[PDB]
């Protein structure tokens, strides 16, 4: 409790600014649509945002839990006490802020994009059900990317953030990446069966639609996603990324890590 806590007034002032920022250039509509995202960390879900922005001709609001963590009223004091381990202390705030925003924006009828990994089915089911009760159509757009490419992506994201700010940069546990990779295929089939989503789609990093339950109702998203996740990536396709990451790690003075050494071998092994 104490400093990790905050007043309703502090919460309110932040909620109001968040709302002001998010609705800029946006307009509520009669039949709103909510797009729940999915895909393991590193897959590149930003590509899904592009496809949805296009579909809605720009009239859509993206709700990303992570963008509110450093907004905790006492973030500065919390950081001085916990430094790199501050994240766990402010997640509650971010979670509450995220739910407050979704609730307010869905009450008004804005088209929404909800950042997510699809690690579980209960979260998206809960969200979709709550939204449909408010008159929303709900879709689920998910990244379908080879596990090796998304894993390298988590590493590159970290090294890049590190280069920008060594203070707040923090790696994605490989366990967190692998758990989504392992459960996502089965989870999408489970979601397919609920019929809650008008359309469940799989996309690659270039925004190419690889699957659509609306288009192929009897085809499960499972096998198609698994195939992509386990697809063997050629050295020709992977070498460029390896070198790019390698160079960033050298700059960050991160050569003495299993990640750097593994990239060296996997690279020299070509």
């Amino acid at each position: 409790a104490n400093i990790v806590n905050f007043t309703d007034k502090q919460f309110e002032n932040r909620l109001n600014d968040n709302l002001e920022e998010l609705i800029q250039g946006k307009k509520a509509v009669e039949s709103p649509t909510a797009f729940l995202l999915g895909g393991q960390p590193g897959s590149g879900k930003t590509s899904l945002r592009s496809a949805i922005f296009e579909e809605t001709q720009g009239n859509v609001i993206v709700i990303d839990n992570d963008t509110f963590k450093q907004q905790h009223p006492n973030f500065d004091e919390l950081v001085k006490l916990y430094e790199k381990d501050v994240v766990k202390h402010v997640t509650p705030y971010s979670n509450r802020m995220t739910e407050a925003i979704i609730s307010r924006l869905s009450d008004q009828g804005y088209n929404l994009v909800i950042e997510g990994t699809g690690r579980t089915t209960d979260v998206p089911i809960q969200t979709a059900t709550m939204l449909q009760a408010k008159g929303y159509e709900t879709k689920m757009y998910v990244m379908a990317v080879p596990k090796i490419n998304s894993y390298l992506g988590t590493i590159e994201r970290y090294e890049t953030m590190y280069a920008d700010d060594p203070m707040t940069a923090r790696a994605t546990p490989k366990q967190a990446h692998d758990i989504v990779v392992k459960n996502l295929p089965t989870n999408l089939e489970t979601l397919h069966k609920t019929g809650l989503f008008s359309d469940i789609r799989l996309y690659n990093r270039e925004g190419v639609k690889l699957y659509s339950s609306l288009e192929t109702p009897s085809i499960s998203p499972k096998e198609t996603l698994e195939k992509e996740l386990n697809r063997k990536v050629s050295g020709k396709e992977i070498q460029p990324t390896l070198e790019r990451i390698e160079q960033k790690m050298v700059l960050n003075k991160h050569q003495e890590t299993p990640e750097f050494k593994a990239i060296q071998q996997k690279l020299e092994s070509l």
Partner: protein, 85 residues
């Protein structure tokens, strides 16, 4: 109709800009500054960041995205100096 290189730049920009914006917003709010008073150094900065964030990154070239990324690196550095006297 997007590239991984650009969507990756956008992801990084989105995380960095949030951090910078939140830092300034937090100060303005914990300090009870009139958000409607652009004469105040921190509020003026907050308003500039609001203007910077209102853009659509999906409508920028790779070069422009790299520029926006540097913009936020520069504001990350600047905000720290302005707030931490």
């Amino acid at each position: 109709a997007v590239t991984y290189e650009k969507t990756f730049e956008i992801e990084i920009i989105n995380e960095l800009s949030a951090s910078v914006y939140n830092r300034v917003l937090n100060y303005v709010l914990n300090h009870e500054l009139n958000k409607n008073d652009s004469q105040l150094l921190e509020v003026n900065l907050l308003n500039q960041l609001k203007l910077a964030k209102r853009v659509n990154l999906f409508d920028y070239s790779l070069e422009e995205l790299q520029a926006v990324h540097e913009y936020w690196r520069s504001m990350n550095r600047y905000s720290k100096q302005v707030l931490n006297k």
